[PDB]
Design a protein around this motif. Structure first.
Motif, PDB file in Angstrom:
ATOM      1  N   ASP A 184     -26.975  -3.623 -36.865  1.00 56.15           N
ATOM      2  CA  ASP A 184     -26.038  -4.102 -35.844  1.00 56.15           C
ATOM      3  C   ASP A 184     -25.702  -2.996 -34.849  1.00 56.15           C
ATOM      4  OD1 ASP A 184     -26.075  -6.561 -37.234  1.00 56.15           O
ATOM      5  OD2 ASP A 184     -24.300  -6.014 -38.397  1.00 56.15           O
ATOM      6  N   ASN A 207     -31.385  -5.784 -36.727  1.00 49.44           N
ATOM      7  CA  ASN A 207     -30.433  -6.233 -35.708  1.00 49.44           C
ATOM      8  C   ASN A 207     -30.094  -5.063 -34.772  1.00 49.44           C
ATOM      9  OD1 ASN A 207     -30.423  -8.458 -37.515  1.00 49.44           O
ATOM     10  ND2 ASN A 207     -28.535  -7.737 -38.478  1.00 49.44           N
ATOM     11  N   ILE A 208     -31.135  -4.520 -34.145  1.00 46.30           N
ATOM     12  CA  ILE A 208     -31.038  -3.397 -33.220  1.00 46.30           C
ATOM     13  C   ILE A 208     -31.396  -3.932 -31.837  1.00 46.30           C
ATOM     14  CG2 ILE A 208     -31.843  -1.075 -32.647  1.00 46.30           C
ATOM     15  CD1 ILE A 208     -30.532  -1.383 -35.559  1.00 46.30           C
ATOM     16  N   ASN A 209     -30.528  -3.677 -30.856  1.00 49.45           N
ATOM     17  CA  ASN A 209     -30.686  -4.104 -29.475  1.00 49.45           C
ATOM     18  C   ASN A 209     -30.631  -2.907 -28.550  1.00 49.45           C
ATOM     19  OD1 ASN A 209     -30.302  -5.601 -26.916  1.00 49.45           O
ATOM     20  ND2 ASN A 209     -30.148  -7.315 -28.332  1.00 49.45           N
ATOM     21  N   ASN A 237     -35.807  -7.813 -36.690  1.00 49.71           N
ATOM     22  CA  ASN A 237     -34.944  -8.253 -35.565  1.00 49.71           C
ATOM     23  C   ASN A 237     -34.634  -7.066 -34.640  1.00 49.71           C
ATOM     24  OD1 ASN A 237     -33.483 -10.167 -34.145  1.00 49.71           O
ATOM     25  ND2 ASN A 237     -31.647  -9.808 -35.322  1.00 49.71           N
ATOM     26  N   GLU A 391     -33.015 -13.507 -45.505  1.00 46.96           N
ATOM     27  CA  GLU A 391     -33.178 -14.777 -44.728  1.00 46.96           C
ATOM     28  C   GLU A 391     -34.668 -15.050 -44.556  1.00 46.96           C
ATOM     29  OE1 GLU A 391     -31.160 -14.494 -41.017  1.00 46.96           O
ATOM     30  OE2 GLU A 391     -29.170 -14.847 -41.853  1.00 46.96           O
TER      31      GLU A 391
HETATM   32  C1  LIG Z   1     -30.849 -10.412 -34.348  1.00 45.40           C
HETATM   33  O1  LIG Z   1     -30.225  -9.288 -33.783  1.00 45.40           O
HETATM   34  C2  LIG Z   1     -29.303  -9.601 -32.755  1.00 45.40           C
HETATM   35  C3  LIG Z   1     -28.906  -8.300 -32.078  1.00 45.40           C
HETATM   36  O2  LIG Z   1     -28.428  -7.500 -33.123  1.00 45.40           O
HETATM   37  C4  LIG Z   1     -28.138 -10.309 -33.391  1.00 45.40           C
HETATM   38  O3  LIG Z   1     -27.410 -10.807 -32.325  1.00 45.40           O
HETATM   39  C5  LIG Z   1     -26.143 -10.165 -32.186  1.00 45.40           C
HETATM   40  O4  LIG Z   1     -25.270 -10.485 -33.245  1.00 45.40           O
HETATM   41  C6  LIG Z   1     -23.953  -9.988 -33.061  1.00 45.40           C
HETATM   42  C7  LIG Z   1     -23.227 -10.319 -34.335  1.00 45.40           C
HETATM   43  O5  LIG Z   1     -23.425  -9.204 -35.201  1.00 45.40           O
HETATM   44  C8  LIG Z   1     -23.318 -10.598 -31.832  1.00 45.40           C
HETATM   45  O6  LIG Z   1     -22.033 -10.057 -31.638  1.00 45.40           O
HETATM   46  C9  LIG Z   1     -24.057 -10.143 -30.620  1.00 45.40           C
HETATM   47  O7  LIG Z   1     -23.550 -10.781 -29.421  1.00 45.40           O
HETATM   48  C10 LIG Z   1     -25.518 -10.468 -30.789  1.00 45.40           C
HETATM   49  N1  LIG Z   1     -26.168  -9.760 -29.706  1.00 45.40           N
HETATM   50  C11 LIG Z   1     -26.910 -10.420 -28.835  1.00 45.40           C
HETATM   51  C12 LIG Z   1     -27.599  -9.751 -27.713  1.00 45.40           C
HETATM   52  O8  LIG Z   1     -27.038 -11.570 -28.940  1.00 45.40           O
HETATM   53  C13 LIG Z   1     -28.620 -11.517 -34.155  1.00 45.40           C
HETATM   54  O9  LIG Z   1     -27.593 -12.003 -34.986  1.00 45.40           O
HETATM   55  C14 LIG Z   1     -29.757 -11.160 -35.084  1.00 45.40           C
HETATM   56  N2  LIG Z   1     -30.234 -12.355 -35.714  1.00 45.40           N
HETATM   57  C15 LIG Z   1     -29.914 -12.614 -36.975  1.00 45.40           C
HETATM   58  C16 LIG Z   1     -30.441 -13.866 -37.572  1.00 45.40           C
HETATM   59  O10 LIG Z   1     -29.225 -11.892 -37.613  1.00 45.40           O
END
Ligand SMILES: *[C@@H]1O[C@H](CO)[C@@H](O[C@@H]2O[C@H](CO)[C@@H](O)[C@H](O)[C@H]2NC(C)=O)[C@H](O)[C@H]1NC(C)=O
Ligand SMILES: *[C@@H]1O[C@H](CO)[C@@H](O[C@@H]2O[C@H](CO)[C@@H](O[C@@H]3O[C@H](CO[C@H]4O[C@H](CO)[C@@H](O)[C@H](O[C@H]5O[C@H](CO)[C@@H](O)[C@H](O)[C@@H]5O)[C@@H]4O)[C@@H](O)[C@H](O[C@H]4O[C@H](CO)[C@@H](O)[C@H](O)[C@@H]4O)[C@@H]3O)[C@H](O)[C@H]2NC(C)=O)[C@H](O)[C@H]1NC(C)=O
Length: 391
Positions: A184, A207-209, A237, A391
């Motif tokens: 995250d 969950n890296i952006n 992700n 998952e």
């Molecule tokens: C895939 O990763 C994305 C980015 O980390 C996750 O989307 C984010 O999730 C957080 C909750 O932890 C939200 O607050 C953010 O707004 C999201 N960011 C974006 C750009 O959407 C997403 O949950 C992940 N997918 C899964 C299934 O976990």
């Protein structure tokens, strides 16, 4: 009152006296009050040796405001042997490092073998966060790191913004931001000038952006190297969007070692502009920098990797998907790829695919006609689902 200035706790700020003791003392004070700020003030330079700011006996939501400059000692006596990090924050909840100041690792003394009777292969990371939940790094610059500039290990809920690294392009192993066992994370509006990977995502990350980042010099944005020494790696992700890469050795890379195991799944690389980048798009399951280059029957399973809107110029191979004979890559998708050779040499190198399955969603430049449309029973027969992911 609420702002703990290190100069009020014995720090000399002259660059020459050792202020480590003073910083630890100020931290102890800041740790007792919520909403407290430890200020490293502008206009002063602080020589600080190895230090660990521990959160176990400390408070949560602390702000470390770096407006001046922190410099590392250049004498070997300050470091001992086997130290993997200079400045460490450990077991904190809601820690923020912010400000427009500078951490300068004086890394040339390490790159250049001036410590000790002997150089360690692994030199200290400049700034490391361990075991922390809710970490923000904003504003600061890390320059001339001994090795990695910024590391997150076993951290969750990370935000890096308005952040700069600056080490020479030819400095050894000076990766920008390294993540391991971290989840995250968002890294954005940052400028990474490095001697190695600008961003390196290691095992245990999900969950890296990454978005709105400029890389160069450096080695690009990489997942891996995964699975070294016959180890298991799990990454999923990962999104990289709106990134510009200038004179890096790779663009967007996934690298894994023969003999590794585990899985890299669900990766999106989109809106990437490359300028004189050697290898813009690469999956390399024969990676062996710093070790042996033999093949083994295990591989990290690479799947569902998407490349969308990647354009610019390249200096070596435009696209390389070199996947393991024992576990082909699958689910590679390409759309809107427009890469032009920067040199004559580059123009003679066509895309290379080996054991790579996927689809072309558009025509590409150069044409990529080597991706296999059929399914891979070989890849599907290796159990790389529940070993890594729930998952
Ligand atoms: C895939 O990763 C994305 C980015 O980390 C996750 O989307 C984010 O999730 C957080 C909750 O932890 C939200 O607050 C953010 O707004 C999201 N960011 C974006 C750009 O959407 C997403 O949950 C992940 N997918 C899964 C299934 O976990
Ligand atoms: C570790 O393991 C790696 C992986 O096996 C070894 O590295 C490989 O070495 C081999 C042998 O030297 C290399 O093989 C050559 O590959 C080329 C390139 O193939 C690719 O590009 C073609 C277009 O240029 C394309 O057609 C190919 O796709 C076809 O072939 C593959 C292979 O069967 C098949 O899966 C596809 O469905 C397609 O049918 C592919 O994308 C290829 O051109 C070469 O073949 C020519 O030469 C051979 C004999 O010399 C001839 O018999 C052929 O008919 C043809 O004329 C040849 O296959 C390969 O590139 C290497 N791969 C990598 C990733 O490096 C490495 O050596 C091992 N290391 C150690 C230490 O053991």
């Amino acid at each position: 009152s609420g702002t703990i200035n290190v100069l009020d706790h014995g720090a000399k700020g002259d660059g020459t006296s050792d202020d480590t003791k003073a910083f630890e003392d100020a931290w102890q004070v800041a740790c007792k009050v919520a909403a407290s700020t430890l200020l490293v003030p502008s206009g002063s330079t602080f020589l600080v040796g190895p230090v660990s700011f521990l959160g176990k006996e400390c408070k949560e939501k602390i702000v470390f405001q770096l407006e001046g400059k922190i410099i590392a000692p250049t004498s070997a006596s300050a470091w001992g042997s086997g130290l993997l990090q200079w400045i460490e924050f450990k077991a904190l909840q809601g820690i923020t490092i912010k400000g427009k100041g500078i951490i300068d690792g004086r890394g040339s003394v390490w790159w250049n073998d001036m410590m000790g009777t002997k150089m360690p292969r692994t030199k200290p990371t400049a700034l490391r966060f361990y075991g922390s939940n809710g970490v923000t790094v904003s504003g600061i610059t890390i320059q001339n790191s001994p090795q990695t500039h910024l590391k997150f290990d076993n951290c969750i809920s990370i935000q890096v913004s308005d952040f700069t690294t600056s080490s020479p392009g030819d400095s050894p192993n000076t990766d920008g931001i390294h993540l391991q066992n971290s989840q995250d994370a968002v890294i954005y509006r940052s400028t990474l000038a490095c001697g190695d990977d600008c961003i390196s995502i290691q095992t245990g990350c999900s969950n890296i952006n990454i978005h709105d980042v400029d890389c160069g010099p450096g080695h690009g944005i990489s997942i891996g190297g995964l699975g070294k020494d016959n180890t298991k790696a799990c990454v999923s992700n990962i999104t990289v969007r709106d990134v510009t890469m200038h004179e890096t050795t790779n663009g967007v890379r996934i690298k894994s070692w023969q003999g590794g195991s585990g899985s890299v799944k669900q990766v999106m690389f989109s809106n990437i502009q490359v300028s004189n980048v050697a290898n813009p798009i690469i999956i390399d399951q024969y990676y062996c920098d710093g070790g042996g280059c033999h093949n083994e029957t295990s591989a990290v399973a690479v799947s569902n990797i998407n490349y969308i809107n990647i354009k610019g110029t390249y200096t070596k191979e435009p696209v390389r998907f070199a996947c393991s004979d024992s576990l082909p890559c699958t689910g590679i998708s390409l759309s809107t790829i427009e890469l032009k050779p920067a040199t004559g040499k580059a123009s003679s190198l066509d895309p290379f695919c080996w054991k790579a399955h996927g689809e072309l969603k558009t025509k590409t430049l150069p044409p990529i006609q080597c991706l296999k449309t059929e399914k891979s029973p070989e890849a599907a027969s290796r159990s790389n689902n529940d070993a890594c992911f729930l998952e």
